[PDB]
Design a protein around this ligand. Structure first.
Ligand SMILES: Nc1nc2c(ncn2[C@@H]2O[C@H](COP(=O)(O)OP(=O)(O)OP(=O)(O)O)[C@@H](O)[C@H]2O)c(=O)[nH]1
Ligand SMILES: [Mg+2]
Lengths: 65, 158, 42, 135, 103, 79, 305, 50, 245, 190
RNA sequence: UGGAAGUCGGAAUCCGCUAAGGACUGUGUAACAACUCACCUGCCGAAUGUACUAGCCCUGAAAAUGGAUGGCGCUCAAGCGU
């Protein structure tokens, strides 16, 4: 994870970096081989948390492609 | 002076078929080396093929003979390149034989077949060739069998 | 005597009959006629 | 076998857990601090105790440094608490003393100084064979 | 003992004289035992037994279906390079439960 | 189970007023919730109902089929 | 002194059933929402810890009881390599250890999360998550558990060969009377049958000579072909010839009723003669009632001499 | 694992570290020497108190 | 009716034949009739009937039907208003019990001579009278049970002794060998499988089959034959004696 | 469904004398006399034909109809018992320790008594008292065989089962230890 | 494949005699053998089989003092439906 972009409940939660359901996070996508139209490596991409980490013990996310 | 008949399954042109015989032909008084040499001499025509060998035992000597089988006849009629067994394995018999050659194989198999007609014998030979996996006239032996049962191919009578 | 064998070995057991408490309520010919009528209607 | 001598009649147990007794053999130890008694039952707040002929687990507090880091099986051969035998005789020794043995009963030492108890001598044949006086 | 010694014992001596008969009788009583377990087991053991029997029934009926049919897609046609493929730039979860400040 | 010789604590059938009121309120709330999900439910529902038909064991099913066919022909002739 | 003390290795489903039955039945199961969060956290933390303790105890019992090949005698190590792919054995036990450590790590993480869980629902979800991850880890071990149970049974039925003792080692072709000799000199139950490869695994018996105990090892028969074409049954005998400092008895059938030629027996003896260095070798001509050395052809007698 | 050992096993050729009889003899000698060295190392390196 | 027997579904390739096999038999019999002059009816009662394949092979020019008796009778035609050819309803009165049809071009005398001099020794079935007394001797059990001399017989297989105990022979395993009593033979008498002049049951016939002792014969009895040219049925010797329907 | 009438028939041989009163069946034969109380099943007995006993149930359910088959088989087994008798041949086999069986007849109780000794070398002496009417003998024709004979099938089979259950190996592998007494043959005396 | 004969494995699974019989459902052998199942025929004698639907009944999870259809007690009810 690179940063927390938006926690929908409160901007203070985003500022604190809280990982909840529906939170947009920024992830390092260097391992997926995502590349632009000329060859630059795209290493930062938004994803959204789809689980409840406080109840499941893990952070599960879906890429926003 | 009593008659003993022993059937065995052996590879042609190989002496070691008598390895399992010496457990039983031993107390009968036969020489295993002589039996293996006779087996190799009888099956020298069937090099590299699994064939059935009949041994008739009279008075502590045995004479060898080769009982023809449909599978061995089909594999021989395939005319495979001459091959060594131990080095390369898992082979497939995907060459072709003619329906004519199937007919003389059935004619050889008439003493074993219980079919009323030579057409009935040819259909059993085609089923054996289908199990082997070869081709007949460039087509599938099941397809030739179905065409024969439909009647557009006329098998000669006897 | 009993000519066959029983699996459990109770050789004294009689030749039992089917448990059909609704026996005798229909003749055979009537059932055949009803079968033909049911088939035609179907 | 868990080292519980069988066939022993009931006698007064004079050596509880924490007692320091003498070492009667020449194994190099001179005293044995008892930490457990083999065959002791379960009872709330009751310390395990042993008598003459009882097998115990002990540690050496004075003696050779090689014996100071291990927990040794011991057999109690003399006790100072008076106890009664089957012939009505009440008796006691002038000191509490035991010997170091293996779990099967054979001694680590080769000789015993002073007498041994009748119960210990009867229950462990190596004590009888290595004893000079039996009382 | 070494190697296949129980098998060698069975070869040289056999089994108990009633072993086949008792095995047959137990297999015959298996149906009554299964019904008795279904009607008399209680609690978590009963729940696990019921779930396991449900799984066996599903597997069995699938086996029956396969043995019965041993001898026997998008709406619009698209080419092979357009298969397995799928404005509003919405996120997969546009709305969640709000979280209070005690939570 | 050794129930007969040594029974356990009995299961009371005497319900409490708290439990009765709570069960009634949960039942009413469930009824309202299923009505709401029925109004919001997107599953397809056929306007026509699949009619069960006529039983095979009815002995005059053939005569009833005769009557239906005759009335169909009569209606077709009238129309 | 054998490997019969290895505890039985259940499969994945039986392992999960055992562990979860211990968690269900050896711990209390009623916790109320009206209690304090400290009591709820203690309840669910105790559940997670007891589950991982059961898993770790069983995995350690599996690991510490199976033999370690790096500490065995070379005969025992290579015999286990002949019977079993040693790569497969080490991979199975390494996967067992990896699953044990992953279970411990998951339990530690979920106990740390239960320290901060704030409700009974969150505690219950965390406990279920930890137990489900443990069950997934155990379910991903379906094949090594069956393999190791089969390994345990065969190791329990394996004979006990002492690598450093007074030992005789009977070798040769099939059907030359090896098991007959072993039955005649020992009390071992080696099957004697006329067919080839009757003995498919090593047998051992014992005898007393001059009040000294000797062990005699009956081996599967050995055929005459290069070592790359040798199956595991014959490689047990090859390993016994290679790693056991023994007295080798090479049995030959002069009458050739074994189904093999005396020339081939001589070539096999000459081929395995390099293994006989620092070993005492005797050639036993068996079945002399049928045919004798005097009745043998003089060229074959000259070759044997 | 099913094809290696068991009732469904089809494995018939072991994985060897040697090809020739002389190589096998050398392997056995080296393994025995290493084994003796390891037991000497372990030997150089009543229950004990807690 | 919750308590019912669980019907086992067989996971095998071959299914039940049904009505289609009956129609196929009807078509085959009704097509075989206009090709052969003579139609014989033969009877094989209380018999194994596994040499009928050899009979079919030897009679290459003939056609043999061995289906259901009532289906063959319906195929030939029970009433004169149903018969395929004249006189066939006369022939249908011979079809009861275990019978068979033989359509042939040959001479009736030739067929009678073949089925008279044909004779093969076969295993007895339950119901036949035992022609002799069979007793397995005490000691080690061999394959034939004393029919051949014991020095020329292999010992019987060790897998058969639970079946022998089920069939009542008090055998036991002694060192991998099946024996009555002791290995040398003592403390017991020989086991009498059957006595002469006694109706054999299936247990005794199964024991005789396991010991390869044949106490019966394979005799096919020709009852009569219908001829197409004369349109009449000639009755043979067994036709008078056999019950008629 | 309540079936109006259901009936069964029991043929009776000429030697057999059957007396039924208040569902108490007494069967007399050449070998002896048997008595049974079938008062727990609602059956009407009759004589529908000379030498045939008729069992009937009126207005009974399917269970009441089905119980007539059990009654029929019980009375038939009583007839078979008083006519031909029942015989259970049992074999006792041993591996190392020979099993010693002694059969006596306790006269004050009037019943047979089977004493079993040296089973797996155990020093206990097992004792089974037989049901009255069951006669136990040691077969002289075969080796290590007991023969239990009687008129009551239930008594003979229960005595044989008691003999089989009293010699049961415990805490051992049944694959390896094969010893015991087993019921070999079940049949009729005549 | 050391051995593998329907039954350790992989892939195919055809034809003939048929009344019918799988390149085989299991037991079994080192491999065979042998037994058995699918299927067919002979005896018998008239109604059955499968899957669902609706009732009642059992299970469908329980802790901790001794107790609760309100209590006795109730079984062609003193239970259930009309
Ligand atoms: N005449 C005679 N026959 C023998 C002699 N020794 C063995 N035989 C026979 O040869 C067969 C060989 O069987 P085994 O004794 O098991 O020999 P083997 O198979 O090589 O021994 P294993 O490999 O351990 O199984 C036996 O069945 C004997 O009948 C002998 O000294 N004289
Ligand atoms: Mg051998």
């Amino acid at each position: 994870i690179l940063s927390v972009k938006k926690n929908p409940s409160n901007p203070l939660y985003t500022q604190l970096g809280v990982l909840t359901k529906g939170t947009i996070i920024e992830v390092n996508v260097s391992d997926l081989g995502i590349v632009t139209a000329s060859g630059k490596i795209a290493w930062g991409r938004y994803a959204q948390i789809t689980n409840n980490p406080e109840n499941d013990g893990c952070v599960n996310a879906v890429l926003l492609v | 002076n009593e008659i003993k008949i022993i059937h065995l399954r052996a590879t042609g042109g190989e002496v070691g078929a008598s390895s399992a015989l010496a457990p039983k032909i031993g107390p009968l008084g036969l020489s295993p080396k002589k039996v293996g040499e006779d087996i190799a001499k009888a099956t020298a025509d069937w090099k590299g093929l699994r064939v059935t060998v009949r041994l008739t035992i009279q008075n502590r000597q045995a004479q060898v003979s080769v009982v023809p089988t449909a599978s061995a006849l089909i594999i021989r009629a395939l005319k495979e390149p001459p091959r060594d067994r131990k080095k390369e394995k898992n082979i497939k018999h995907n060459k072709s034989v003619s329906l004519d050659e199937i007919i003389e194989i059935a004619r050889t198999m008439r003493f074993k077949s219980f079919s009323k007609d030579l057409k009935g014998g040819v259909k059993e030979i085609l089923g054996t060739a289908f199990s082997v996996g070869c081709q007949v006239d460039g087509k599938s032996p099941k397809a030739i069998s179905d065409a024969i049962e439909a009647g557009e191919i006329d098998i000669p009578d006897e | 005597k009993n000519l066959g064998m029983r699996k459990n070995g109770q050789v004294w057991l009689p030749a039992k009959k089917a448990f059909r408490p609704t026996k005798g309520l229909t003749s055979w010919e009537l059932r055949v006629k009803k079968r033909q009528e049911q088939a035609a209607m179907k | 076998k868990r080292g519980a001598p069988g066939g022993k009649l009931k006698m007064t147990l004079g050596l509880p857990v924490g007692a320091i007794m003498n070492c009667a053999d020449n194994s190099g130890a001179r005293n044995l601090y008892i930490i457990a008694v083999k065959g002791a039952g379960a009872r709330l707040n009751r310390l395990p105790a042993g008598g003459v002929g009882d097998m115990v687990m002990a540690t050496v507090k004075k003696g050779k440094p090689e014996l100071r880091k291990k927990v040794h099986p011991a057999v109690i051969v003399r006790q100072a608490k008076p106890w009664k035998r089957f012939d009505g005789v009440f008796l006691y020794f002038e000191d509490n003393a035991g010997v170091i043995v293996n779990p099967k009963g054979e001694m680590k030492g080769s000789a015993i100084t002073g007498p041994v108890g009748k119960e210990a001598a009867e229950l462990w044949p190596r004590i009888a064979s290595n004893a000079g006086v039996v009382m | 003992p070494q190697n296949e010694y129980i098998e060698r014992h069975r070869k040289l001596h056999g089994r108990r004289l009633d072993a086949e008969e008792r095995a047959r009788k137990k297999a015959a009583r298996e149906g009554h035992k299964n019904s008795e377990n279904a009607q008399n087991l209680r609690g978590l053991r009963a729940k696990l037994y019921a779930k396991q029997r449900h799984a066996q029934k599903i597997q069995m009926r699938k086996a029956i279906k396969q043995h019965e049919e041993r001898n026997v897609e998008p709406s619009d046609p698209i080419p092979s390079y357009l298969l397995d493929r799928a404005a509003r730039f919405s996120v997969p979860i546009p709305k969640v439960r709000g979280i209070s400040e005690e939570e | 189970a050794g129930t007969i010789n040594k029974p356990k604590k009995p299961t009371s059938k005497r319900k409490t007023t708290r439990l009765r009121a709570k069960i009634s309120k949960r039942a009413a709330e469930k009824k309202r919730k299923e009505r709401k999900l029925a109004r919001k439910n997107p599953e397809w529902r056929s306007k026509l109902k699949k009619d069960p038909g006529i039983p095979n064991l009815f002995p005059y099913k053939e005569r009833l089929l005769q009557q239906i066919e005759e009335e169909r022909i009569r209606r077709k002739e009238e129309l | 002194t054998g490997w019969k003390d290895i505890p039985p290795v259940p499969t994945a489903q039986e392992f999960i059933d055992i562990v979860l039955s211990r968690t269900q039945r050896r711990l209390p199961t009623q916790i109320r929402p009206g209690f304090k969060i400290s009591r709820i956290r203690a309840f669910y933390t105790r559940k997670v810890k007891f589950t991982q303790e059961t898993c770790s105890e069983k995995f350690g019992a599996i690991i510490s009881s199976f033999p370690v090949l790096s500490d065995q005698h070379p005969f025992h190590r290579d015999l286990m390599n002949i019977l079993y792919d040693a790569d497969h054995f080490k991979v199975a036990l390494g996967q067992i250890s990896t699953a044990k450590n992953l279970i411990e790590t998951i339990s530690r993480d979920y106990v740390r999360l239960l320290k901060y869980a704030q409700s009974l629902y969150q505690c219950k979800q965390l406990k279920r998550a930890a137990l489900g991850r443990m069950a997934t880890l155990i379910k991903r071990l379906k094949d090594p558990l069956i393999y190791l149970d089969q390994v345990r049974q065969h190791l329990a039925r394996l004979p006990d060969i002492n690598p450093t003792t007074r030992t005789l080692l009977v070798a040769g072709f099939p059907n030359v009377g090896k098991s007959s000799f072993v039955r005649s000199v020992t009390r071992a139950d080696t099957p004697v049958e006329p067919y080839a490869f009757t003995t498919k695994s090593l047998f051992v018996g014992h005898l007393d000579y001059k009040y000294l105990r000797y062990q005699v090892i009956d081996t599967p028969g050995i055929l005459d072909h290069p070592l790359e074409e040798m199956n595991t049954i014959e490689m047990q005998s090859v390993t016994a010839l290679a790693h056991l400092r023994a007295a080798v008895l090479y049995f030959m059938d002069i009458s050739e009723q074994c189904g093999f030629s005396l020339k081939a027996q001589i070539n096999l003896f000459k081929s395995i003669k390099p293994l006989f260095a620092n070993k005492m070798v005797f050639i036993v001509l068996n079945k002399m009632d049928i045919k004798k050395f005097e009745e043998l052809d003089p060229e074959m007698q000259q070759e044997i001499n | 694992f099913s094809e290696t050992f068991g009732p469904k096993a089809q494995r018939k050729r072991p994985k060897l570290s040697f090809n020739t009889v002389d190589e096998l003899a050398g392997y056995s000698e080296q393994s025995l020497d290493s084994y003796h060295a390891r037991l000497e190392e372990k030997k150089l390196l009543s229950v004990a108190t807690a | 009716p919750k308590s019912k027997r669980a019907r086992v579904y067989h996971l095998t390739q071959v299914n039940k034949k049904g009505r289609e096999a009956k129609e196929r038999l009807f078509s085959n019999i009704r097509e075989t009739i206009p090709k052969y002059q003579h139609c014989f009816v033969f009877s094989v009662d209380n018999m194994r009937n596994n040499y009928l394949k050899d009979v079919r092979h030897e009679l290459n020019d003939c056609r043999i039907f061995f289906g259901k008796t009532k289906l063959m009778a319906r195929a030939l035609g029970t009433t004169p208003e149903e018969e395929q050819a004249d006189g066939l309803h006369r022939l249908t009165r011979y079809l009861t019990g275990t019978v068979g049809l033989l359509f042939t071009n040959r001479d009736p005398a030739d067929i009678e001579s073949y089925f008279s001099n044909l004779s093969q020794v076969d295993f007895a079935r339950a119901g036949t009278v035992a022609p002799r007394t069979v007793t397995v001797p005490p000691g080690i059990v061999y394959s034939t049970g004393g029919e051949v001399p014991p020095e020329h017989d292999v010992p019987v297989s060790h897998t058969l002794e639970p079946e022998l105990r089920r069939l009542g022979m008090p055998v036991r395993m002694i060192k991998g060998k099946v024996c009555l009593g002791d290995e040398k033979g003592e403390a017991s008498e020989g086991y009498t499988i059957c006595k002469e002049g006694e109706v054999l049951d299936s247990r005794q016939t199964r024991l005789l089959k396991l010991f390869s002792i044949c106490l019966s014969e394979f005799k096919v009895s020709l009852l009569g034959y219908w001829s197409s040219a004369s349109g009449e049925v000639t009755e043979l010797e067994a036709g008078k004696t056999r019950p008629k329907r | 469904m309540r079936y109006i009438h259901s009936e069964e028939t029991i043929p009776v041989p000429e030697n057999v004398k059957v007396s039924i009163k208040s569902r108490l069946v007494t069967v007399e034969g050449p070998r002896g006399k048997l008595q049974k109380d079938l008062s727990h099943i609602a059956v009407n007995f009759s004589v529908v034909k000379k030498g045939v006993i008729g069992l009937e149930i009126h207005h009974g359910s399917r269970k009441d109809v089905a119980a007539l088959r059990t009654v029929r088989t019980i009375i038939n087994n009583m007839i078979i018992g008083v006519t031909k008798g029942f015989k259970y041949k049992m074999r006792y086999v041993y591996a190392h320790f020979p099993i010693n069986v002694n059969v006596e007849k306790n006269a004050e109780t009037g019943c047979y008594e089977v004493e079993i000794r040296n089973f797996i070398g155990e020093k206990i002496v097992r004792k089974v008292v037989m049901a009255p009417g069951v006669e136990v003998e040691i077969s002289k024709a075969q080796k290590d065989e007991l023969i239990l004979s009687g008129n009551s099938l239930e008594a003979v089979s229960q005595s044989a089962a008691d003999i089989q259950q009293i010699c049961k190996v415990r805490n051992k592998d049944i694959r390896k230890f094969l010893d015991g007494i087993y019921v070999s043959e079940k049949g009729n005396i005549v």
